[PDB]
Structures are given as structure tokens and as C-alpha cells.
Amino acid sequence: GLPWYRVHTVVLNDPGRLISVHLMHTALVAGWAGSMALYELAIFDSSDAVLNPMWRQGMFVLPFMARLGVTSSWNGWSVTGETGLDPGFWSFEGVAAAHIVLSGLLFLAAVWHWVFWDLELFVDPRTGESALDLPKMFGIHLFLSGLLCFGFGAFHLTGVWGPGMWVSDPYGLTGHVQPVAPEWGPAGFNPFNPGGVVAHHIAAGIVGIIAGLFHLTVRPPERLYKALRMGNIETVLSSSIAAVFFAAFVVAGTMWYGNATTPIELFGPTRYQWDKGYFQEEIQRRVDSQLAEGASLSEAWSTIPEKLAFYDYVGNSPAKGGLFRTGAMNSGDGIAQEWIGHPIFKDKEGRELEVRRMPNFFETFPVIMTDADGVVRADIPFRRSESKFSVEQTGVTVSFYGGALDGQTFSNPSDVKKFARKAQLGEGFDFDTETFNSDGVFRTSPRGWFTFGHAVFALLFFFGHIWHGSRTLFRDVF
Amino acid sequence: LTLKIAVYIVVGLFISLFIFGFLSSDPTRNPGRKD
Amino acid sequence: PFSDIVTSIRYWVIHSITIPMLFIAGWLFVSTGLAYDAFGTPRPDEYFTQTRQELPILQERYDINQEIQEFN
Amino acid sequence: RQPVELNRTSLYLGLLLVAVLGILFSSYFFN
Amino acid sequence: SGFAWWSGNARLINLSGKLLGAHVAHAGLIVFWAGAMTLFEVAHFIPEKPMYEQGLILLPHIATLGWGVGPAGEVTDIFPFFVVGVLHLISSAVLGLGGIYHALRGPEVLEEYSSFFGYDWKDKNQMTNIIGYHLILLGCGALLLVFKAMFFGGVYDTWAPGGGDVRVITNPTLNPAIIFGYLLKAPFGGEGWIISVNNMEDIIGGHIWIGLICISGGIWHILTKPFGWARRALIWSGEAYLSYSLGALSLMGFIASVFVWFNNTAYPSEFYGPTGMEASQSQAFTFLVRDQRGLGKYLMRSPSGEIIFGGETMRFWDFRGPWLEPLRGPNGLDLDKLRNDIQPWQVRRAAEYMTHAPLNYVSPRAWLATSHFVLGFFFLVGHLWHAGRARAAAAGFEKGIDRETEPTLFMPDLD
Amino acid sequence: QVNNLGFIASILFVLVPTVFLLILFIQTG
Amino acid sequence: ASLWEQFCQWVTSTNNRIYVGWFGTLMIPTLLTATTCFIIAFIAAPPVDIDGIREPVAGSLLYGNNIISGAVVPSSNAIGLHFYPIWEAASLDEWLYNGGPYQLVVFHFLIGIFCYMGRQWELSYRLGMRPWICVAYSAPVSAATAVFLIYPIGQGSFSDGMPLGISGTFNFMIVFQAEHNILMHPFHMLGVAGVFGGSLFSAMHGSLVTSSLVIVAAHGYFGRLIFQYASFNNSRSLHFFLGAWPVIGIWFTAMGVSTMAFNLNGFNFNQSILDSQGRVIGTWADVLNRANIGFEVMHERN
Amino acid sequence: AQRTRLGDILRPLNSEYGKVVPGWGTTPVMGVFMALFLVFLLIILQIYNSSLILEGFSVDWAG
Amino acid sequence: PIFTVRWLAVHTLAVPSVFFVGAIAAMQFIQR
Amino acid sequence: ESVAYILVLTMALAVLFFAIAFREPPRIE
Amino acid sequence: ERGWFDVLDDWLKRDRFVFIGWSGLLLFPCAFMALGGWLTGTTFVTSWYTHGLASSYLEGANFLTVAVSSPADAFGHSLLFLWGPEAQGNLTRWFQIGGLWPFVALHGAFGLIGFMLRQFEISRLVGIRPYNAIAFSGPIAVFVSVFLMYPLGQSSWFFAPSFGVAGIFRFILFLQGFHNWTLNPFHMMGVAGILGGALLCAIHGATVENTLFEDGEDSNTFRAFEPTQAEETYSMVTANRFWSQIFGIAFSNKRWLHFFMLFVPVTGLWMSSVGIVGLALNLRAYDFVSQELRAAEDPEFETFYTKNILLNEGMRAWMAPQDQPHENFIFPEEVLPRGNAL
Amino acid sequence: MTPSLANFLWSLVLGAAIVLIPATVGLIFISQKDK
Amino acid sequence: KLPEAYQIFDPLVDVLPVIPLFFLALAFVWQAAVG
Ligand code: CLA
Ligand SMILES: [Cl-]
Ligand SMILES: [Fe+2]
């Protein structure tokens, strides 16, 4: 009778068992959220938040709890970097337990609705058939979404009766949760303004209340009711699927490009901050403003926080991974331990050289050192070629400032080559490649896995839209 | 020697079986006319 | 329809003055060098200035008109 | 409504699709 | 009967008179091209520039027969090429006339008029008589090549000493062990099934046998009728006889495609240019006679044990050319025949041939080999089309399945 | 050095859909 | 009856579960020998010195390969176009080390797929059918012999045929592109028009026949979607176009790889646009050459 | 059909199935709001895309 | 009539067609 | 890794063999 | 009285030379802009300031080397409207900065939306199931993932395919050398779906043409069909027996047979689109780290996969300095990979 | 009111001057007279 | 190059080879027009 791909159509005209089949899906999603949080609380390394942040450990749902206020755990530690706080119940373990308990309660509601499906509430008296007033179901749910949106932005985000949301400096160095006030100017439409997410939820929530009230009290036009097939529940599945692949394309974009809702302390830096030298320029901005104070070359380069120098490393870029390079970034180059300092390369003629950094495209970039005029002065030959610009023919030396190798020099051409290969990846670090038995191939951050999962799901959900849109408009010939 | 001889025989077996199969009035083996 | 159109002359007498002059106006648009100026296409001697063989690759985003003018 | 049917031909079309997806993706899972 | 416009030549299958016109008229088109393309190629010929550097494919064919060429490939006379190209154009007018005549003015059917020319596609005795009339005539065109080589000036021998030459073949190889041993050489590397024929005495001696075998079979078919095993295995119709010939031309198109590709004896490099194997050996050889001023910087020792040119040219060690054999010994290339016995004509020829060696231009061998592989292929396609159609039409279901008597519906179920 | 979960992921990728299709085909006649 | 005609009856029997026929008496042993030797060599064959300077490529699963990277490696370059049966090697180790299993599989596979073509006609003949399904199947056959047999012959070595593997196929395509620029070859553009067009018509024919099921409403639909006459109102003319379009496009691209075997390459448009002073103005065809040059210089060894 | 206490309170909320206003109703008003909603999405798209640069702005992390 | 919807679908398609062909014909005589 | 590769390849052949030797006989409508 | 709407609605569905419908109000003005924008670009507009390349007929390029090519990487993902803050209404500057590329893409995007709406509107008109529209979702999935989603994941529109023949060929070798696209399993599924479609099209046409019913004495079988048949032209029973003895299996259901001709090519285009979304984020199936690890400890370990990693490394270094001129890549000859140095 | 904003507003007034006049009123007119 | 006596016929000699080609490219309207 029923093919395998049609077995779920048995609740198509059974409202009591569609509520039950939704209560079951809701229990499984809430059950995943609670047990994903418990699995991530089990493997999370809370020790270092600078060179082992959460996004380096593959934590996917742990940044989403911290985005809204849940920063500490019952075990004392926290993600902002402090220890021993008093979260109360609403820690990472309290939120995880509240989703496991919720999942268990939604499971029991699904069993009741699957057994007691023949409710007089769903029966239409005029014809005896089960019927759902879909235009008024929409008005009710729009009214509750309007209130839930409004109260979220008016009490939670504003901190009126909530924790606020995660904000940070432009360079992701001092990030925390604090009450954000709404921005009502045009500056609220700046994606990187945290106050525009608050002004949105108050305004979009208010609008969703008035529009909710309109749909509670004004019937559909007769021509829209028949055009859009407002009596068929599959026209709601076709419209909802459209709205959700629309929303999935947006969250995939705001994660990849970055905005206030996706900070880099939680999801890592974006691929565009490496293409544009976003952190490399701020580091030089800070150093040259110290060298302007008559400071030494190491005095200045020792004031750079290694967290800022850690964002300026191409292994942290979300566009350096592989589809089947699985796990945490720490399974790639390894657990970052410390910053080796800033290398200054100089040839035998006293020409300060710059190692060209690796673009996001290249799985392999040649090592090239140019001078202040972009002239190539030294390089590492390919494998065994004959060269005019070897590091042994040009006498390249490297001396470090700040970091672990401060005040040291290397003219041994084996170490000059080794430090030049670190320099084409940005700032150099020491990595613990023995904890996770790391390969040496870069992974992707949670910023890249989210963007990939949600751009693929948004594209797949476009097919489900046209497919269900064609089964609601062509319901007669099907 | 013996593997070259055995393959020459095996290949010799199958080729003339195919040859004598089509010489065996193969046009008459059809559900249509026969002539 | 279509049959009487192709098999008449009131179709073939206004086209005998309009397809030629629309083809010639296309010829002169290129012959007189107006196509290079309208679309900013470099003439076979405008690809480079008197010594720069640097490809005039656009670097900024909003002041292109100054850049295209400083490239030529 | 109706019970679930799955004839023998659709069982094969499924068993072939799964194993061939298992042949294609085994080398990337092992990496 | 009712063929569409795009299969209109199938309306001719049963019009023996009108089909004779389509054939004699088509034979004129072939003779026209061989006369018109020859006059084209001579009108665009620098008679001291290499014949291959000018895209000529028909003039190399006349040169190899010893017409208008001298020792080492100089064109001593440009008139004979013109006479050949003119003797074809005029004969093309005769054939084109007799095709236009039969197809338009002659009797549409020839059994009306003559029992000698009128043929039935199923009269097996008259069908074999026409093979005999043609086999006798093919064997005589094969002895024409033997008579040009032995008694009418000789053919061009590229293996003559000191560059090639036009040489009369006064001792053609007649021993069937050498002639019919070429038919039993493997078609693989080093063997070269019949492409390996590398002397004119074998080529001219092999056409003596072909001249007599085709006349032996021609008189055999005029005087006999098909045997029992021939009548039971074959299809006897007009479209079947065409499919048999299409498979024979398929086979010949491929053999000519590789013969012009490897062989340089019947396709001398003086006229067709070096083979792709000969251009690469010329390069290694030339680089050796320049750096002059089992190893030795361009030589190596084949796992055979033979001294061969080295590098990318290593795969072309089975190449044998007239300019490289004087310096080749029993165990491959001798190392002081290389150091002493290098004549200036070998240095000068092996520099001609490396011009287009690896590391714009298409050699006349690539044109002739790519052309006839493609034609050989599509003629195997047309054989399958016609062999299948001829045997379906013979059985009687080439127009579709009869709903009345569909043969599958009477068959029992498979499982 | 292969992925440690590569075997459990290559087996479940084939077993779980395979087991489902046989239960679906056995519980049908 | 005689034991021959009792064997000849079983061979030509249209009541066998799988038809043998007379072409199947050649196709079955050859394709079974090619199947047997391909699987053992894909799993457990030792590395093959394909380049001829003792630099063995590993191709089997038991030597550190997966399904994607595994291949049966072509014959050694020290073999060229020489016939290399087992008995022609002085050892079973020397045979494997020189790429022996590649010649055995390819030769049997080629014989088998041509006897497959005669066997498709043979059952055609004996079911009362028209015989031109073997003619459509000649298009994937010509493409197989082009890269297995024809291109090795033109290039002068069986090490130039396509490897029998997934990643060995991609390697064959890349170094073919580097030295022939097959993308700008027009027979390959017809082959792509053949597979992209054949796969459009497949989806186009499938979607209109399925839609038009509880019929004439299909042809009237496509009539509107295009001018009005872009469709064959004749179902037999439509299906002839269905088979002919990919068969012709694949025929051409198979005859394109076979002419490139003789180094007759695709289109060359390098150095095509210059300025008044002679400098090069690049097209999109010069960026392709840099990719071809980059693919090519990595392929040679000196 | 089983009756429940909760099902009897929600009964007036699932009573007007199928009831519509005749003709076009409020479709012109909806058509206006879909127009305003399209312009709005174009604005915030051109702001994010930096195709629409406004006063006192930088679509940038430092804002 | 004359100003049907084929007069527009043909002339917004052909007026640019003859102009561009006039331009491409002239480009063949740019001696570069 | 190599056993999993051989396990999935021999499964694809077992489906082919059963899909041919043990198939529900065709009932063309 | 038929107010202004259903008079307009009945006018858009009037039977004429081409069906306009409601979707034609989006298909026809956007298909004309996209194809007219591409012709104007491949005839007059250069890519000299964006790519450093001649790409128009005016510059002397031929049919295979013309392209409406990507904008400059400087603009990022700017939509580059004519009135936008880059060209600022200047139309000759808009052509020089590659503004024509989004113009063709965006109109091609909405033209493709209107054409798929055309299939829905015409199917609903004649009352059939719209399988042709959902079969067109394959092409639309490829277009938006390759021409929109891939450059958006990348740094700019510069890396989207150019609207040309050699410009498409450039996008093809780029994704091999930089992404190892052949190795990607989603491309392998798309290659199987298209080659499987061209096989179904070749084998279904041949099977119909050779199992034809003899419905005429004329030896032109094209004259034995006519539109109004209560029966089919070919014997499905004979065709099912041929392929069951030749191939082992055969179709029994013309409905399942034709859905398969629908499903195989459409699924291939949707699977390869999923792998292009991955390449947008450089989430590529580039390496098998088990064989890269072995090839590093063991120099003697060579695989056909490792042979391709080396081919890709050489293509990147020789192509990049001219494929990405804004990058200003200076690679000396000794850092350029070549086989003489391995 | 920035340049980018003034040109954006003109895009809505000149984009509606090809979708209102003569697009929707040219289809309304041609349909209200071919009726 | 043709002998001096026949260099008159040169422009027609340049056309002779393609004459077999364009009678195939003309018969496709001889038969097409008539039917
Ligand atoms: C969108 C949802 C989502 C996202 C973005 C992530 C993201 C992440 N997860 Mg997670 N996870 C999820 C859902 C998600 N997960 C769910 C639902 C579960 C429950 C099973 C888990 C359980 C889980 C565990 C146990 C772990 C993670 C980990 C991670 C991190 C690394 C993951 C990785 O290695 O990539 C791997 C991705 C792939 C290999 C891609 C698979 C693609 C498949 C094979 C496609 C199949 C093709 C299809 C069959 C063909 C179509 C058929 C056709 C014929 C029609 C990463 C940030 C890891 C971590 O870092 O720890 C903190 C970790 O250990 N996750
Ligand atoms: Cl290689
Ligand atoms: Fe069909």
C-alpha cells in the first residue's frame, strides 16, 4: 500500500496524531540539545581560554549557550576566563538538564496525543470531518511569537529581567555577557551593532502582536483562500519550508561573514579577517604606537597579547579545513601552547624582509621573502631546484621580539627555513601535537561547520518547498 | 612452456567453437523466415 | 499572421531602407571608434601607457573613476 | 491508513544504493 | 519500397541498370579528386622544399613509384606528376558520362537486355562471376606495381645505400616462407604484423603472390558456384553483400591507418616526412653529433642488452631507419661506428627530421592516419548497421514486430 | 594512520539503512 | 540428436535465464578472465614500475590504498607496445612488476566488450527484433578502445593507456589535458553536448511521460513552453532522437581522443591578441595554458 | 468524538473553518505591506553589502 | 493589426540583432 | 581499513547476484 | 463585470505564438536582460581592468575566448548596481569594473525563477503533474550553487565562473588545482548522474526504435505512428525479455522506467551542488591524510592519488600569478614546482 | 542623505517607472481593449 | 607549380578539388525542394 517515502502521510488528516508526531520531533530535538551539551561538557578543556578557546575544541552548541548569558558551569570554571563564580541553576549543566527533562516531558505528551487522538476539538460539527481552521491557527501562533519575540528583546537582551547577550571589543579580546540597550537610529541596522538585535526584537515582536491580532479577527479574502489553497494543510508546509530555507540562508551568511550574533570568542575568526589582514593590521597599529613612544623593538612587541596574535594565524581561519577532516582544530596543528614572538627576517645586506602569507585558497604556498619594495630577495626552492635566492645564498637571519623566543637570533639556515614556513601562516606558535595525536592538516571552526550545514540544508529545503508547493496547487491531478 | 600451450588450447577451443557455431546454419535460427 | 507578411512587399519595402541603415549604424559605431569610448574598451594602443606594462587592475572599491583616470 | 509495502525489486534497488554509497564514502570516512 | 528522401539510394537496390549508373558516376568522383587534387598539389609545390612541409599527400604517392624523383628525394621532373593528375581528370569525364548515362538514359533493368551484365542479387552463380571479373582485374593491378618496379623504371627504394634512390627490383622475394611469414607476426611492438615489411624486394615479391592469388581466385569463381557450407552460413541479398564489403573496408581503413603511421619503406620519409618514432630518434641522434664537440650522455643499455638512444626516446628503440642502420651493429648501435662512420648525409637528414620533435604543424602521416582510423571506424559502424539490417530483412522483421505473431509472447517465462 | 571511527562510521553507514530495508521487506508479505 | 546440436541448442536457447549465444561463448570466458584478474590485481598486486626508472606506483588495496586511490597500474614503459603475456616474462614477479596484469585485463576486456556487441545483435535476431541496439552500444565501446588501445598505440606505449582505477582515471584526464588541451578540442565539446544534452532529454522525456499519466496532454504542454514546434509529434521520431543524440556525441569525442593519439590536438589560441607594440594581451585561453603548463612540467622528469 | 475540559475551552478557536470574506477582501492592503517589506529587505541587504552607505556608519566589526 | 505582441517580441529582438551584426562585421576589418 | 573496503565491494556483488538469480518474475502490464 | 484583474489574467493566457502567462512578466524581461547583457559584454566590454584579459570581439577574441567575466576582487561581493556607490551611474565605468557580470547573473537568476514558474503555470493550465518543473530544479540548483553560492563563500565575485567558453574552462581547471574537485565524492555522484542520464537516453531510444511494432508496410517506420494511438509503438514485453537475458535485469513498468530517466540526472545535479556548497567554504575533499602521512615518512610510497596531489600543486603555482592579477604573486623560477626537482 | 542613499531612492522611483509605466498599465490597457 | 603553358588555368585549379564536395552540399536542396 504505502511506499516507504509516504509512511508519514497517515497523520495528514489526523490532527491529534500530527500534534503527537510534532511533540515527538520536539522531544528529539530538545533531547539532542541537552545531550550534545553534556557530551561537550565532558570533553571540554576549561584550563586555557586564550590559546585553547572553545572554538578550537570543536564545541558546537557550547557557544550558543554563552551567546545568551550561560557562561559558567557548576564545576566552578567559566568561558569568559574566570573561575569559581555563582551561576545558580542556569549553568551549562542546568541548561543541559532542563533540555533532557523537557525532552522527557514532550515524549509523554506525544504518547497521550497518539492514544487519545479522537478529540472533539478537532471535529468540525457542520460536516463531521476533522478540520483545522488554518487561518486562525496562524493568528494564534503569530500572536504568541509576537509576545515571545518582544519579551525576549525587552527583558532578556535589555537586561531588564535577563542576562543580556554576548558583546565584545572589535578584536574579540574582552568579551562577556552584559545588558544591551536598543539602538533606534539607522545604526540599529548595522549588523555588528548588538543594540540593533535588541531594537529588532522589540519592534518585530510588537509588529508580530498587531499582525497576530489582525489574523485572529479578519478572515482571509475569498480569492486568496482559494488561490493559496488555505484549506489544505500542505499549503502551510509549503510556505513554512520556504520561510525556513530563507532563514537558514541568512544564519549561514551571518555566520560566514560575521555579525554581532556570531562573535569570534565563541565561533572563531572569519575567513575574511585573514584575507584582509584584520588582526595583522591592529597588531602593527599597537606596536608602532609603542615604537612611537621611543620604546625598544621588543618592548613594543611584548605588549601584544597572544590572544590577539592567535587570531592572526591562518590555522584559525575557517576556510582552511576539509569536508572529511573531522573533529576539533586541535586535531590539526595541535593544542596551541604559547606564542614564539614576532620574527624579523634580514638578508646579508641588512634588508628587512617580509615572508608572504598564505592565501585562503592555497593548500600549498611557496615561501617568498620580499623587501620594502616587493622585490623577492630570498625564498625556499621547490624541492631540489637550483636557486639564486636560497636562504644560504642570501644569508637570511631571523631574530624574534616578544613571546617565547624574545631576544634570540637564528642564522642557522635550517632554523631560518623553519621559521619562514611558520611566518607564511601568520603568527607562529608552539603546538602540543601529542595530546590528540594531531595530523598536521587544518580543520574547520564551528563557524565553518555551521555555515556548511545550514547552506546545504537551506539548498535542500528549496527542493522540499517546490515539491510541497506542487502537491498543494496540483492536489487534483496528484 | 606449459602455460603458453594451455592458453593456446583454451583460446583455440573457444574461437573455433564460435566459428563452427555460426557456420551451423545460423541464419535459420530465428523466429521469422528460414532460407 | 506570418505568411502574408513574408510574401508581400509593404513588408519588404520599409525593411529595404531600415535593415540597411540599422546595419550601417552598427558599422559606423565600430568604424568611427565610438565603441571603444562608450564601453571603455582599450584601443589596440591604449592597453598600456608610455612605459607601464602593469595591468591596470582595480584596487580600491569606491573611487574607481579616479583610478581608471590615473591608469590612463 | 495503509500498511507499508516494500517489494523485492525495491529491496534490491535499496540494497544496491546503500552498498554503493558505502563503497564511495568508506575511503573518505577512513581518511 | 517506400524509403524516405534521406534513404533514397535504397530505392536503387533492385534497379540493376540505374544502380550501375550510381556506381560509374561515383567512380568518376574518385578519379576526379585524384586528378583535381593532384593538379592542386602540383600547382602549390616548391619542387626543392621537402614534400611533407607543404601538406602534400598525393605527390608522395607518385614519387614512391619512381616518377619525377631522384636519389634522396629530389624532384627531378615535375611533369610526370602533372601527367598523372591530368590523365585522371580526363578519365573522370568518361566515367562521369557513363554514370550519367546509365542512371538517367540507360535501361533501368539489365536482365531485360543481357544475361551477362544483368544480375539478380540472389543468383549466387552470377554474383560469384562478378567477383571473378574483379579479382582477375585486381590481381592484374597488383602485377602492374610489379611491372613498374621490375621493367618500367623501378620504385623508390628508401633503403638504397647513401640516401634513397629509384631502383629496379630485379630480385623480388618469392619464397612463401618470407612472404607468408609476415602474415603470422604478432601485431605488437617489435613485431609489426605486416607493417614491419622493410624492403622493396618483400613488397614487390608480395604483390607477385597477390597478383597470382587474386587471379587464382578470380578464375576459381568464374568456374564455380558457392558450396554447401557457403550457402548455409551467408546471407544472399544486395544489402548483405554491401555489409560484407563494409567490414572489409573497416578492416582496411585501420591497417592503412597504422601502416602510414609506423612504416617508412612503402612511405619513405623523403616524401611523407619522418614517422613520429623517427622524429624522436633523429633528435637524440642529432644531440649526440652536436655534443660530440654503453653510456655516453644519449645512449643506454636496453634490458635486452642492446645500446639504444636514451631519454623520452627510449620507447622508440624498435625504430629502424635508412640513416640509422649503417651505424647500427649486431648488438644495437655500435659505439665507434657512432664515433667514426657518421656520413654527412646522415647528419643532414637526421636534422631535417627532428624539426618537429617534442620540446602549428601537422605531418602528412597524422593527416593520413587520423583520417583512415576515423573512416575505418565509421565503416565498422556501417557494417553493423547493414549486417544487422540485411539479416533482419532476410528473416522478415526489419520493419517491426508483428502484433499478430510477436515471437516473445509464445516463449515461456524466464523464471 | 586512518580515522579511529572510520570503521564504525563505514559499518553503520551501511548496516543501519540495510537493517531497515530488510525489516521493511520481511514485515511486508 | 547429436551431442553437438544438443550443445548448439543450449547455446542459442532463448529460454536461458541469461542468453549465451555464439558471441557469448567468447564473451563469457574473456570477461570472466578480465573480471578475475582485475579483482585480484586491484586487491593484492605488487607495485608497478610504470615509468621505467624503478619508481613503482602502488595500486592495490593491500599495499596502502583505498577504493578511490586504488588502480590497476598500466604496463611498464620498458614494455611499450610489446605483447606481454605471463609466459613471456621470465618470472611471475617480473610480470607483476612490469604491469603484466594490466595487459591481461585490458585485452580480455576489449575482446569481451566486442563480443558483447555481437551478442546484443544475436539475441536481437532471435527475438524477432530490429538489430540496431548493438549500434548504440558501439559508442561507449569506441570510447573504451580509444583510451585503452588506440591512444597507447599512437603514443607508442601501453603505459599511456588509462589506469584501471578512480584516481588513475583523473590522472589520465589531467595529463591528457596538459599535453593536448582537450577542453578546447571541438570533438570533446560535441561529447559534452552529447552527455549534457542526452542527460537533459533523459530528464525531459522522463518528466513529461510521468506527468502525462491519467495521453496527449504532454505534447501540448511542451508546445507552449517553447515556440510551438520544438517537439516531435511523432513518438517514434522522438525516441530515435533520444538514442541518436548521445550516441553521436560520444562517437565524436571517441574519434577525438583517437586522433589526438596521433598528436592532432585541439584548438590553440595562444599569443592571439597583441597590442600595437607587440606585447601579449591575454585571453581566457592563455590562463588555461598556464594551467596546462603547470600540469605538464610537473609530469615530466627532465 | 471524545470531549475534554481543555477541548471545550479551545472549541471557539477551531469553529470558523472555511469562513472567508467574499471577493478580494484586504488583498490590496496586503499587497502594500509586501511592497514595503521588499524595500525594507533591499535596504538592510544593501547596508550589509555596503552598497548603501549611510551617515555615521561602518559595516565593520568596529561598530 | 500591425502593433501586435509579435511586432514587439520581434523588433526588440531584431533591432539590436542587426546593429550588433553591423558592429561585428566592421570588427573583421580592424587590422590589429 | 582494507577489510571494510573488501566488505563493501563484495556486498555490491551479492546484491547484483541476488537481483538477477532471485528476482520477482516480471509481470509486464 | 470582470474587473481589471481577471480580464488581465484571461489575456495573459490567451493562445498565441508564445504563452506569456503571469510568469512571463518575470521571465521575459529578465531573460532578455541576461542574454542581452551577455551579448553586449562578449562584443564590446573588456576585462582589462578586472582580470587583465581581452574578452570581447572588439579586442579580437573569438567565439570561444569571449566572456562576460567576473568583477574585480577589490569590490568583494558588491552587487555593483549601475547606480551603486562604485559606478555611480557612470555606465562606461560600470562596464570597465565588471558590473555586467552581476547584471547577467542576477537577471539570469530571476529569469530562471520565472521560467520554472512558467512550467508550473503551463502544467496547471493543461492539468498535468508538474514533474517538468521539479526536474528543472536540478539546473537551478547547479546555477545558484556555482554562480551565486560559490563566490559568496569565497572572497569576491572574482572567483565565480565567467560567462564564456574558455572562461568556464578556467573555472573548471581552477577547482581541480585548488580544490581537487574530481576527488570530491559529491562530484563523483554528479558525474554518475549525468553519464547515467546520457546512458538512459541512448538505451531507451534504441530500445524503442528496435522493439517497434510493425504497423506499416513502408520501410520508413517513422510513418507508422500518428499522435492518436490507443496502443504503444514498441513491445515492452519483448524489450523486457531482451534486457533480462542480455543484462540480467530489465524494466517492467513504463511509469518506473520514465521516473528513473527523471530521477537519475536530476539527483546527480543536486548531489554535485551539495559539494559545490562545500567548496564555497573551502570545505573540500582534497586529501587522504593516511596516504599523505605515509608518503611523508616513506618517500618510496607513490599512489595515483599522490600523483594527482603533485599535479595540483604545479597548476596552482603556474596559474595563480596570472589567474589572480590583483594578488601580485611573484614566484621565482626556483619556487615553481616541476618534475625535475622531485 | 548620502550619495549612496539618494541614488538608492532614485532606483526605486526609476525602477517603478518601468514597472508601473508602461508595464502594468500597458498590460491593463491592452487587455481592457482586446476584451 | 603548373608548367608555364598551363598557369592560365591556375584560378580554376584552385577550385577543382572542392567540386565533389559542393555537389553534396547542393543535392540537399535539389531533392529537398522537389520533395
Ligand atoms: C548542523 C548540525 C551540526 C553542525 C554544524 C555540527 C558541527 C560539529 N560537530 Mg556535531 N553533531 C550533530 C550536528 C552538527 N554538528 C548531531 C545531530 C549529532 C548527533 C549524532 C552530532 C554529534 C557530534 C559528535 C560526537 C562530535 C561532533 C563534533 C562537531 C564538530 C566537528 C564535526 C566534524 O568533524 O565534522 C564531520 C562532518 C562530516 C564528516 C560530513 C558528513 C557528510 C555526510 C557523510 C553526507 C552523507 C551523504 C549522503 C548520504 C548522500 C545523499 C544520498 C543521495 C544518493 C541522495 C563541529 C563544529 C565533534 C567535536 O568536535 O567534538 C566537540 C564531535 O566529536 N558532533
Ligand atoms: Cl603524474
Ligand atoms: Fe518512452
XYZ file of C-alpha atoms in Angstrom, chain K residues 85-216:
132
model
C 28.434 53.557 -4.961
C 31.067 52.114 -7.323
C 29.972 53.174 -10.811
C 27.665 55.936 -9.503
C 25.541 55.972 -12.646
C 28.545 56.211 -14.965
C 27.849 53.476 -17.487
C 31.258 53.241 -19.161
C 32.801 52.807 -15.709
C 30.194 50.151 -14.931
C 31.371 48.157 -17.947
C 35.051 48.520 -17.034
C 34.570 47.318 -13.448
C 32.778 44.109 -14.417
C 29.343 45.410 -13.475
C 27.869 43.399 -16.345
C 28.616 40.123 -14.559
C 26.121 40.530 -11.664
C 23.718 42.044 -14.199
C 23.727 38.802 -16.184
C 23.791 36.614 -13.068
C 21.021 38.426 -11.180
C 18.760 38.636 -14.230
C 19.650 35.068 -15.135
C 18.732 34.111 -11.576
C 15.319 35.780 -11.728
C 14.842 34.682 -15.323
C 15.382 31.095 -14.200
C 12.854 31.633 -11.416
C 10.365 32.927 -13.968
C 10.992 30.023 -16.329
C 10.374 27.485 -13.579
C 7.229 29.422 -12.694
C 6.383 29.140 -16.395
C 6.488 25.346 -16.130
C 4.177 25.447 -13.110
C 1.774 27.836 -14.837
C 1.590 25.835 -18.065
C 1.284 22.486 -16.267
C -1.566 23.870 -14.157
C -3.140 25.159 -17.371
C -3.300 21.786 -19.144
C -3.900 19.909 -15.883
C -0.886 17.615 -15.536
C 1.570 16.957 -12.742
C 4.462 19.471 -12.751
C 7.310 16.953 -12.879
C 8.989 19.081 -15.545
C 9.277 21.991 -13.107
C 10.774 19.921 -10.290
C 13.081 18.287 -12.839
C 14.256 21.800 -13.723
C 15.265 22.312 -10.080
C 18.425 20.360 -10.924
C 19.688 23.023 -13.327
C 18.603 25.779 -10.923
C 20.412 24.071 -8.043
C 23.598 23.969 -10.125
C 23.262 27.611 -11.174
C 22.736 29.125 -7.739
C 25.386 26.980 -6.039
C 28.059 27.593 -8.684
C 27.277 31.138 -9.845
C 25.981 32.563 -6.546
C 26.823 30.388 -3.533
C 30.408 29.547 -4.500
C 31.622 33.166 -4.932
C 29.722 34.220 -1.806
C 31.602 31.664 0.270
C 34.784 32.844 -1.438
C 36.255 36.335 -1.113
C 34.513 38.044 -4.048
C 32.556 37.621 -7.262
C 36.008 37.410 -8.892
C 36.104 33.645 -8.342
C 32.685 32.829 -9.766
C 32.652 31.377 -13.295
C 32.785 33.841 -16.161
C 30.082 33.699 -18.828
C 32.243 32.297 -21.597
C 33.536 29.036 -23.000
C 37.205 29.409 -22.093
C 36.075 31.330 -19.012
C 34.066 28.314 -17.897
C 37.029 26.066 -18.724
C 39.081 28.283 -16.408
C 36.653 27.734 -13.526
C 36.955 24.010 -14.251
C 40.741 23.692 -14.029
C 40.762 26.107 -11.078
C 38.584 23.819 -8.956
C 40.836 20.883 -9.860
C 44.130 22.508 -8.919
C 42.830 24.447 -5.926
C 40.030 22.203 -4.624
C 40.770 18.741 -6.087
C 37.190 18.639 -7.308
C 37.495 15.252 -9.039
C 38.373 13.655 -5.698
C 35.214 15.073 -4.124
C 32.595 12.320 -3.639
C 29.729 14.702 -4.443
C 31.200 15.387 -7.871
C 31.521 11.623 -8.377
C 27.798 11.294 -7.681
C 27.062 14.095 -10.139
C 29.270 12.510 -12.790
C 27.373 9.252 -12.301
C 24.054 11.085 -12.613
C 24.831 12.761 -15.930
C 26.615 9.811 -17.528
C 23.745 7.679 -16.258
C 21.317 10.077 -17.912
C 23.067 10.031 -21.275
C 23.112 6.237 -20.990
C 19.383 6.049 -20.247
C 18.697 8.394 -23.154
C 20.832 6.310 -25.521
C 19.479 2.954 -24.345
C 15.796 3.927 -24.147
C 15.724 5.466 -27.610
C 17.482 2.432 -29.067
C 15.147 0.025 -27.263
C 12.023 1.783 -28.517
C 13.396 2.071 -32.058
C 14.216 -1.653 -32.135
C 11.204 -3.152 -30.339
C 8.872 -1.171 -32.611
C 5.612 -2.797 -33.648
C 5.223 -3.400 -37.368
C 2.287 -1.061 -38.021
C 3.015 -0.407 -41.694
